[PDB]
Each structure stands twice: as C-alpha cells, then as structure tokens.
Amino acid sequence: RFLKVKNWETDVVLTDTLHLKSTLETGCTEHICMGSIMLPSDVRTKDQLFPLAKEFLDQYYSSIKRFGSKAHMDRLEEVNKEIESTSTYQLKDTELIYGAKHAWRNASRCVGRIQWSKLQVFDARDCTTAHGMFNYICNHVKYATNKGNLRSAITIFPQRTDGKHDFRVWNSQLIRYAGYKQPDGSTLGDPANVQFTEICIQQGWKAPRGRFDVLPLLLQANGNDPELFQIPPELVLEVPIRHPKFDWFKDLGLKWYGLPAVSNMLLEIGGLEFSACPFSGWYMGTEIGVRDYCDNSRYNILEEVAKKMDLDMRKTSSLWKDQALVEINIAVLYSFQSDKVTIVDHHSATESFIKHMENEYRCRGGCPADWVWIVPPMSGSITPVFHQEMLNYRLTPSFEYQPDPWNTHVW
Amino acid sequence: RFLKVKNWETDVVLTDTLHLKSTLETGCTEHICMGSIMLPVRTKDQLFPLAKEFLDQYYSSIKRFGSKAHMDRLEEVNKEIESTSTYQLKDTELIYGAKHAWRNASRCVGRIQWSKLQVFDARDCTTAHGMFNYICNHVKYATNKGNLRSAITIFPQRTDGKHDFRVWNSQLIRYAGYKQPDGSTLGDPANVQFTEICIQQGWKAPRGRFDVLPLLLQANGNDPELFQIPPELVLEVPIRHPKFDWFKDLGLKWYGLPAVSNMLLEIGGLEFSACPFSGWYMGTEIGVRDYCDNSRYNILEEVAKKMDLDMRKTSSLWKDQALVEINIAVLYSFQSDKVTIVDHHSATESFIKHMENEYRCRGGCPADWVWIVPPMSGSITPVFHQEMLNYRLTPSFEYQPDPWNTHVWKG
Ligand code: HEM
Ligand code: HEM
Ligand SMILES: CNCC#Cc1cc(F)c(F)c(CCc2cc(C)cc(N)n2)c1
Ligand SMILES: CNCC#Cc1cc(F)c(F)c(CCc2cc(C)cc(N)n2)c1
Ligand SMILES: C[C@H](O)[C@H](O)[C@H]1CNc2nc(N)[nH]c(=O)c2N1
Ligand SMILES: C[C@H](O)[C@H](O)[C@H]1CNc2nc(N)[nH]c(=O)c2N1
Ligand SMILES: [Zn+2]
Numbered sequence: 001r002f003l004k005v006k007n008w009e010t011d012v013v014l015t016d017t018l019h020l021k022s023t024l025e026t027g028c029t030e031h032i033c034m035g036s037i038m039l040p041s042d043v044r045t046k047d048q049l050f051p052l053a054k055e056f057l058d059q060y061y062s063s064i065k066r067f068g069s070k071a072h073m074d075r076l077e078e079v080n081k082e083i084e085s086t087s088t089y090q091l092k093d094t095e096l097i098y099g100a101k102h103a104w105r106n107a108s109r110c111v112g113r114i115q116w117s118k119l120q121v122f123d124a125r126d127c128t129t130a131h132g133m134f135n136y137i138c139n140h141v142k143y144a145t146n147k148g149n150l151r152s153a154i155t156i157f158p159q160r161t162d163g164k165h166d167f168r169v170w171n172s173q174l175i176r177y178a179g180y181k182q183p184d185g186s187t188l189g190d191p192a193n194v195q196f197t198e199i200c201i202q203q204g205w206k207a208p209r210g211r212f213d214v215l216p217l218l219l220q221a222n223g224n225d226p227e228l229f230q231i232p233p234e235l236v237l238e239v240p241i242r243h244p245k246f247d248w249f250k251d252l253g254l255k256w257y258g259l260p261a262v263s264n265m266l267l268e269i270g271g272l273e274f275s276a277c278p279f280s281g282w283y284m285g286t287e288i289g290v291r292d293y294c295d296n297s298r299y300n301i302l303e304e305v306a307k308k309m310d311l312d313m314r315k316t317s318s319l320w321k322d323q324a325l326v327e328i329n330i331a332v333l334y335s336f337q338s339d340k341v342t343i344v345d346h347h348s349a350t351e352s353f354i355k356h357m358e359n360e361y362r363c364r365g366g367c368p369a370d371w372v373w374i375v376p377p378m379s380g381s382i383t384p385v386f387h388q389e390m391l392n393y394r395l396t397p398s399f400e401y402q403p404d405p406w407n408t409h410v411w
Numbered sequence: 412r413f414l415k416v417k418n419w420e421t422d423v424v425l426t427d428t429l430h431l432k433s434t435l436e437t438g439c440t441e442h443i444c445m446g447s448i449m450l451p452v453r454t455k456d457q458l459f460p461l462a463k464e465f466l467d468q469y470y471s472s473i474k475r476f477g478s479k480a481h482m483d484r485l486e487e488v489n490k491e492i493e494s495t496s497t498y499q500l501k502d503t504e505l506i507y508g509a510k511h512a513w514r515n516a517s518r519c520v521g522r523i524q525w526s527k528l529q530v531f532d533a534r535d536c537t538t539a540h541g542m543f544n545y546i547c548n549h550v551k552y553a554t555n556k557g558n559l560r561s562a563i564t565i566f567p568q569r570t571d572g573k574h575d576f577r578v579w580n581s582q583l584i585r586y587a588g589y590k591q592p593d594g595s596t597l598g599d600p601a602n603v604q605f606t607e608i609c610i611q612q613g614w615k616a617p618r619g620r621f622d623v624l625p626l627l628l629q630a631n632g633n634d635p636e637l638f639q640i641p642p643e644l645v646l647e648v649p650i651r652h653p654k655f656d657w658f659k660d661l662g663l664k665w666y667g668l669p670a671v672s673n674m675l676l677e678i679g680g681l682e683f684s685a686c687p688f689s690g691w692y693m694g695t696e697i698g699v700r701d702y703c704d705n706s707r708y709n710i711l712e713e714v715a716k717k718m719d720l721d722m723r724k725t726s727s728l729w730k731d732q733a734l735v736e737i738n739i740a741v742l743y744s745f746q747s748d749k750v751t752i753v754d755h756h757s758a759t760e761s762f763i764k765h766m767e768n769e770y771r772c773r774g775g776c777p778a779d780w781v782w783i784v785p786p787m788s789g790s791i792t793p794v795f796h797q798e799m800l801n802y803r804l805t806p807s808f809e810y811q812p813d814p815w816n817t818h819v820w821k822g
Contacts, residue, residue: 005448006449008449008706009704009706019443020430026439026440026441026442026444027435027444028436028438028439028441028443028446028639029440029441030438030439030440031430031436031437031802032414032430032433032437032439032443032802033438033444033446033779033800033802034444034542035439035444035447035780035781036446036798036799036801037420037798037800038417038798062593098520113432144452153671197582227780232789234416238420238759283728290790290791291790294790295420295790295796296420297419297697310500317694317742317746317754317756317757319739319740319742321756321791322735322738322740322787324729325788326731326732326735332730337726344727345726347725347726347730356437359449370444371447371781372447372780372781377789377791377795378530378731378787378791378792379731379734379788380786380789381700381703381704381786381787382703382731382734382787383729386786388447389447389449390447391440391442392446392447393443394442395445399459
C-alpha cells in the first residue's frame with residue numbers, strides 16, 4: 001500500500017504514496033497486465049459532478065495552503081450552489097490554470113514533465129465560432145513558436161455542455177503533413193494522415209498533392225460542421241534536414257516542422273470536460289528521426305538512407321538499419337540546432353525526467369509514469385529511464401483520448 | 412470472455428482466451444500498473460489441486476484426457492501425496508513440464524524454440540560432486556563446439572525447504588568482479604558480491620578482467636562446495652570489429668553459452684530449486700547490456716574515444732554511435748567463430764511469428780513488452796508495435812532469493 005520503486009543502475013529507492021490518491025482505473029487486474037495496450041478504457045449527470053468538483057477544489061485550496069479556510073468553504077459552497085442550479089459550473093481563471101498545469105503534471109506517458117509548471121494557458125472559453133477558433137490557434141502557434149525559441153502553451157476552448165455542442169479540433173496535431181494514396185499503388189507524404197487528408201479534400205480542400213504539404217485546420221465550434229482554414233505559412237516554422245557529415249543527405253528532400261502541438265485530446269478538470277484543448281511544447285529528437293522518419297507505416301526512409309550510405313543490406317545482422325537510424329537522428333538534432341529551433345535529445349530528456357521524478361517523489365510523494373512510453377524508441381538501455389522502475393496510475397486533472405470526430409459527428 | 416491485442420504497424424488483431432487459464436497474480440490492480448517492476452514452505456493442503464491441474468494439462472496435450480491412464484495417474488498421485496506429503500513426476504511429465512515452463516516464460520523472446528529443449532533428468536543426484544558432473548555434461552552438450560543446443564538439467568525437488576539443491580552461481584558461466592581499494596572495479600561489476608563469496612570459500616582468484624568464476628554447488632541443503640569448470644568446456648569468443656582493427660586491442664571477449672542457474676522451476680506444485688537452463692545469445696544481451704550498461708563493463712567511453720566521435724555534447728549521439736559499432740562487433744565475432752548467436756532483428760521477427768502461431772493454436776501467448784523489446788533500436792523491431800498481454804501460467808520459472816541470504820551454515 002506504500003510502494004517502492006528501485007533504479008537498478010543507481011540503487012536509488014523511492015517510496016510512492018501518491019498512488020493512493022489515484023481515482024480512475026488502469027485496465028490491469030491482478031490476473032492480467034495491460035501495460036502495453038495503447039488504448040485501454042456520455043453526458044455527466046448532476047450527481048457525479050459535485051464529488052469531482054469537490055476533489056479538485058480540495059486539492060487546489062491545499063496547493064495554495066488554504067485548505068479548510070474561509071475562501072475554501074465559500075468556493076465549495078458556491079460551486080455546490082451552481083451545480084445544483086445550472087447543472088454544471090465554471091472554473092475561476094486561477095483554477096483553470098492550475099488544472100491545466102496539473103493535467104500535464106499527471107500525464108504518465110510524458111517524458112517532458114520537468115517543465116510542467118511553466119505552461120502558458122490561453123483562456124479561449126469566450127470563443128463561439130470556427131473563425132474565432134482559428135484566430136485563437138494562430139495566436140497560440142505564433143506564441144509557442146517564438147521564432148524558434150519554443151514556449152509551452154495550451155489553448156482551452158469552451159467545455160462540453162450536453163455533448164451536442166462540442167468544440168473539436170479535427171486535426172490530431174495542429175501541424176502535420178498530408179498523405180495521399182497513389183494510383184501507382186504506394187503512398188505519397190505521411191501515410192498516417194491519409195484518412196484525414198481525404199476528409200479535407202472530401203470537404204473542400206484543394207490539395208497540392210505533395211510530400212510535405214502542411215494540412216489545413218478543420219475546426220468545429222459549438223457542435224456545428226467543421227470548417228477549413230490554412231495556417232499562415234509564415235507561422236509554420238519548418239526545418240530542412242541535413243547531416244553534418246553526409247552532403248547527400250539534403251538530396252533526400254526531408255524537412256519537418258518545429259512545433260509539436262497535440263489537438264485531439266480531452267482535458268478533464270474537476271469533472272468538467274474540455275474537448276478542444278490544443279497544447280504544444282518542443283520535440284524530442286527521436287519523435288521525428290525514429291518514429292516519423294523510420295516507422296514502416298510512416299515515411300519509412302531507412303532503406304533509402306542505408307543505400308546512400310552503401311551499407312551491407314543483405315543480412316540483418318550487419319545492423320545496417322541501426323547504423324542508418326543513428327545517422328538520421330544525428331541529422332535531425334543537427335538541423336534543428338543549426339536553425340536555432342528548440343529540440344532535446346533523448347539522453348538529455350530522460351536525464352531530466354529522472355531528476356523530475358526525484359523532485360516529485362520528494363515534494364509530492366510520487367510520479368505516475370508509463371515505462372512503455374517513457375523509454376525512447378532507440379538506445380533504450382543507455383538512457384537512465386530504462387533502469388528506473390515506474391508505477392503507472394491515473395490522477396486527475398488529466399488528458400484523455402476521445403473518438404475521432406468524424407465517427408461521432410451528427411452531420 | 413475474450414481479449415484483443417493489436418499490432419499498430421500491421422493492424423493485425425489477435426484474440427486471447429488463454430488468459431482465462433491464468434491462476435497466479437501479476438502485481439497490478441485496477442488502480443496501479445506494476446508492469447515495469449523488476450521483481451513483483453508448502454503443505455499437502457494445496458498440493459493435490461496443483462498436481463491435478465498439471466496432470467489434466469498433461470493428459471490433454473497427449474490426447475488422453477479422462478482416459479484410464481489419466482484417472483489411474485491422478486489416483487496414484489493422490490495416494491502418494493497423502494502418504495508421503497509429496498509426489499514424483501514421471502520422466503514424460505518432467506519433460507512436458509520443463510518445456511511448458513519455457514513456453515510460459517512471458518519475458519523470453521526466444522520462445523519460438525520452446526519445443527526443442529533437451530531435458531536432463533538429474534533427480535538421482537545426491538552430492539555437490541554429482542551436481543558438478545551433471546553440469547559439466549550439460550555444458551558440453553549444449554555448447555556442441557559452437558553449434559549451441561538448448562538444454563535444462565533438473566536436480567531433485569524441494570522437500571522441506573531445509574534440504575534444497577541450489578546452484579549459487581546466477582549463471583553457469585560468468586566473469587569475476589573485484590572491487591579495488593581505489594573504488595574502481597576489475598572485471599564484471601555485477602559479480603562482485605558472488606566473487607567475494609567464492610574467494611571466502613577458498614577460490615584462488617587470478618584477478619583479471621575476464622576470469623571464469625568457479626561453480627558453487629549446494630546439494631541436499633549442505634554447505635556449498637567449489638568446483639572449477641574445465642577450461643576446455645568453456646567456449647569463448649574474442650571480440651573484434653569487421654572494419655575497425657583497433658577494436659581487438661580493447662581486449663574484449665565473451666563466453667558462448669548463456670546458462671541461467673538461479674531460477675526455480677515449478678511443475679504441478681513441485682519446486683525444482685536447481686534447474687540450470689541454457690540456449691544461445693541474442694547479440695544485444697552482450698553488446699548493449701553486458702558491455703555498455705554504466706553498471707557493467709561500461710566501454711562506451713573508450714570505444715567512442717577510439718572512434719574519435721564528438722564526445723562533448725550528448726546531442727552528437729556519440730553514445731548511440733559507439734553502441735551500434737560494439738553490437739556489430741559482437742555479432743561479427745560470434746558468426747566468424749561459428750558460435751550460435753541471433754541478432755535482435757531476427758529474434759523479434761521470429762517472436763512475432765511465434766506469438767501469432769500461439770494465439771491460433773493455443774488461444775494466447777503471455778508476453779512482457781518491457782522485457783521483449785530489445786534494449787537498442789526498439790521501434791525498428793516489430794515487437795515494439797505489438798500489443799501484448801502479460802499473465803502467469805504454470806508450469807513456470809520463478810525467481811527465488813539468493814541462497815547466501817537464506818542458507819543455514821553447517822560449518
Ligand atoms: C515541452 C517539451 C515536451 C516534451 C519534450 C514532451 C515529450 C513527450 C513525448 C516524447 C511523448 C511521447 C509521445 C509519443 O511518443 O508520441 C509525450 C507524450 C505526452 N505529452 Fe509531453 N512533451 C512536452 C510537452 C508537453 C506539454 C506542454 C503537454 C501538455 C500541456 C504534454 C502532454 C503530453 C501527453 C498528455 C502525452 C501522452 C499522450 C498520450 O497518452 O498519447 N507534453 N510527451
Ligand atoms: C534459445 C535461445 C534463447 C534466446 C535467444 C533467449 C533470449 C532471452 C532474452 C534476450 C531474455 C531477456 C533476459 C535479459 O535481458 O537478461 C530471456 C529471458 C528468459 N528466458 Fe529466454 N532465451 C533463449 C532460451 C531460453 C531457454 C532454453 C529457456 C528455459 C528453458 C529460457 C527461459 C527464459 C526465462 C525464464 C526468461 C525470463 C528471465 C527473467 O524473468 O529474469 N530461455 N530470454
Ligand atoms: C497514434 N500514435 C500514438 C500517439 C500519440 C500521441 C498522443 C498524444 F496525445 C501526444 F501528446 C503525443 C506526444 C506528441 C508531443 C506533444 C507535445 C506537446 C510535445 C512533444 N514533444 N510531443 C503522442
Ligand atoms: C536484474 N536483472 C535480473 C535478471 C535476469 C535474468 C534472469 C533470468 F532468469 C534469465 F534467464 C535471463 C536471461 C539470460 C538468457 C538465458 C537464456 C537461456 C538464453 C539467453 N539468450 N539469455 C536474465
Ligand atoms: C504496442 C505499444 O504499446 C506501442 O507501440 C507503443 C509503445 N511505446 C510507445 N512509446 C511512445 N513514446 N510512443 C508510442 O507511440 C508508443 N507506442
Ligand atoms: C526497471 C525495468 O523493469 C528494468 O530495467 C528492466 C527493463 N527491461 C528489461 N528487459 C530485459 N530484456 N532485460 C532486463 O534486464 C530489463 N530490465
Ligand atoms: Zn499492469
């Protein structure tokens with residue numbers, strides 16, 4: 001009930017008590033572990049909402065050292081009145097900022113949480129239309145990009161009411177490249193976005209059918225039909241990918257965007273649901289060089305790079321895939337660093353997370369963490385997180401997945 | 412009930428029913444996942460149901476469930492338990508049990524081979540000298556001049572827990588480690604404590620960097636005795652690199668036979684506390700973990716020095732570069748000396764084929780993603796993208812405490 005995690009490289013042992021405050025469920029049971037399942041796990045009635053609000057307000061007033069105070073009881077009373085009356089309630093700006101920052105703090109799959117307290121929160125709860133959503137998102141993108149000196153930010157659109165008036169960003173990330181199925185048979189651009197790219201065409205977009213076409217935004221306000229907008233190209237910071245040794249690398253024609261900005265998640269704070277809450281930070285190099293560039297279901301460039309390196313691709317035991325993989329990831333970090341765009345390598349990011357874990361255990365009693373997601377997709381065991389035992393559990397406020405809107409939209 | 416796992420690279424979905432036959436617990440609950448935790452005395456009371464369940468499985472596999480042979484064996488075992496408080500496995504049952512303990516080992520990526528295991532019955536052994544002879548014959552059989560063959564040797568089962576057979580070595584072949592007064596370590600830092608025990612027990616240590624440890628063998632609960640494996644039985648591979656001629660001058664070698672000797676084999680409620688088993692290496696076990704863990708031989712720095720990589724910032728990925736070159740050298744050396752080894756690309760591809768086959772013929776395949784995914788180049792192997800279900804089936808291999816912590820010394 002009071003659990004210990006060991007680091008097997010350093011023998012440092014930490015005691016976790018924070019998990020006892022966990023609320024939601026993991027998908028595991030004592031008979032089966034679902035730790036490697038990507039996605040384990042609907043209006044909220046008047047009755048479930050007030051306990052959720054209480055739990056959150058309890059932790060908020062604790063965090064400002066006003067638990068059991070004047071202002072604490074009054075606020076509890078006031079939200080209790082507002083739920084009984086209005087069947088919902090509205091967060092104070094202070095509570096919203098706290099709730100967003102703690103949703104990031106609680107994201108057990110995120111290695112970048114040492115930065116959790118330095119999040120810029122843009123309150124977009126006064127937004128009513130898709131053009132207004134576009135305006136808020138352009139401002140976010142410009143603020144977060146900051147001429148390459150990236151700054152973490154989240155923009156929070158109005159909360160779900162009765163599930164019929166949902167705000168949704170249909171894109172999975174604010175900035176992604178299009179994908180097209182060729183008549184010749186294969187796929188041009190990003191295969192992961194083929195379905196979404198179609199819904200852009202099959203709803204209005206005129207695609208330039210290229211390999212790195214920044215997709216338009218598909219924005220849904222108040223449950224209406226979504227609308228297309230092009231992000232101003234001057235707001236989309238991109239980085240051409242070259243290698244500090246291989247001059248032929250530029251001829252591969254690779255580039256990537258500077259801003260990782262997740263837009264399809266749901267932010268839960270005190271029982272309230274924010275279905276449109278795009279948030280952004282900066283990349284860890286392996287997200288681009290390992291996953292985006294070298295997954296077989298993505299841009300899948302390993303063979304081409306290895307050929308240009310003239311590696312022995314006859315046998316897997318030559319480790320030609322591994323050699324190319326390293327070089328590709330050297331180039332990504334080199335390109336971003338050269339163009340002065342913020343990026344972190346996996347050695348620095350995971351060392352930071354270990355320091356963050358130790359901070360959280362010391363000052364908070366724990367840190368929920370998903371080892372399957374925290375360990376980088378290359379060189380796992382030479383990063384310190386590989387040797388770190390981690391306990392995974394679900395705290396709120398939280399970011400949660402939600403269905404893709406095209407499968408849900410009453411059109 | 413049914414459970415589905417998805418491969419996110421291929422979209423292949425599999426359906427697990429085998430998890431319904433799981434009895435033992437995992438460590439997880441609905442509120443916490445313990446999937447990255449390294450480590451998450453028996454009476455007649457509990458023994459006959461464990462025996463019956465094993466014998467039901469055994470006779471089902473031989474298409475004789477409910478037969479007179481099956482019923483007679485259940486009767487015979489029942490009377491043997493109530494009369495002697497234990498029972499003896501037939502040779503056929505022991506072989507089945509050892510093969511299925513391997514088949515059920517959710518952390519083992521090499522299970523495609525599970526049905527080709529050579530089982531050596533050493534249940535007639537009575538002294539540490541007899542154990543030594545059995546272990547020598549195992550090492551010679553399994554080594555097979557470099558054409559490695561999987562094998563297991565099974566010493567007498569536990570009775571009252573005061574007469575255990577134990578191999579005090581964690582592996583049959585391992586290099587000594589010596590703590591120097593200046594704080595540095597010579598040899599394998601992981602084996603320092605065991606090396607000190609051997610020295611205390613009378614071993615004259617050569618005090619080199621690659622000294623094969625003596626066997627420390629405990630029969631029938633007696634004090635352990637020291638034995639030296641004949642050097643002609645210990646196959647070793649000098650490590651060189653196919654392009655870098657300076658790599659040989661690092662003075663590295665490794666042994667050919669990975670032979671785990673500290674686990675407990677549970678079959679039908681019987682506990683075999685001494686059951687060394689061996690296969691052949693996957694390259695990364697040596698090149699990534701043994702050589703490159705900070706807590707092990709830790710050769711990244713000197714290798715990266717001789718490669719003259721930019722070692723000033725981690726974002727040069729000099730650690731990742733050297734790591735690949737070391738792992739090329741391990742595979743090249745083993746193949747050149749015609750010693751069996753498998754690279755992590757081949758091994759993970761075979762595991763996926765094994766897993767799919769097990770889902771079809773058996774209804775599932777328990778697998779521990781955290782251990783199955785290799786410690787370098789994770790996401791360019793197919794297991795990274797494979798959802799897996801972890802649950803505990805018997806027969807099984809289990810951990811047990813190091814015997815020097817529990818042994819009652821006779822003197
Ligand atoms: C500032 C630098 C940041 C870095 C380097 C970083 C890094 C990462 C990485 C590497 C992942 C793994 C996801 C994948 O492999 O696709 C991840 C997941 C995640 N990040 Fe962070 N992140 C950062 C900022 C943020 C911020 C600002 C938020 C929210 C305010 C956030 C929320 C999350 C969440 C919720 C996940 C898990 C999503 C899921 O379950 O699929 N991250 N992060
Ligand atoms: C034949 C080739 C084999 C290969 C390539 C192989 C590979 C591996 C690897 C890479 C691991 C992870 C362990 C680590 O990283 O230290 C492992 C674990 C394991 N292997 Fe296999 N193995 C093989 C044969 C066998 C055999 C013959 C047995 C038993 C009869 C076996 C039983 C196990 C068990 C029980 C584990 C779990 C270890 C633990 O939980 O600590 N393996 N194997
Ligand atoms: C479909 N594949 C599974 C997936 C995924 C996935 C889902 C998310 F919500 C999510 F935030 C991420 C991380 C991407 C990311 C986001 C931020 C802000 C920074 C960063 N450096 N990286 C990844
Ligand atoms: C903190 N580390 C704990 C550990 C460990 C550990 C324990 C085991 F029982 C075990 F079999 C292994 C795998 C070694 C191995 C064994 C075989 C037969 C083949 C192979 N290729 N490799 C590793
Ligand atoms: C099946 C498995 O859970 C899946 O491939 C996971 C593994 N770990 C991951 N880790 C990160 N950071 N991102 C991912 O998309 C995944 N995918
Ligand atoms: C903390 C974590 O469970 C631990 O470092 C594990 C991770 N995965 C592993 N995987 C394998 N194959 N072998 C190991 O020793 C480990 N160690
Ligand atoms: Zn679990």
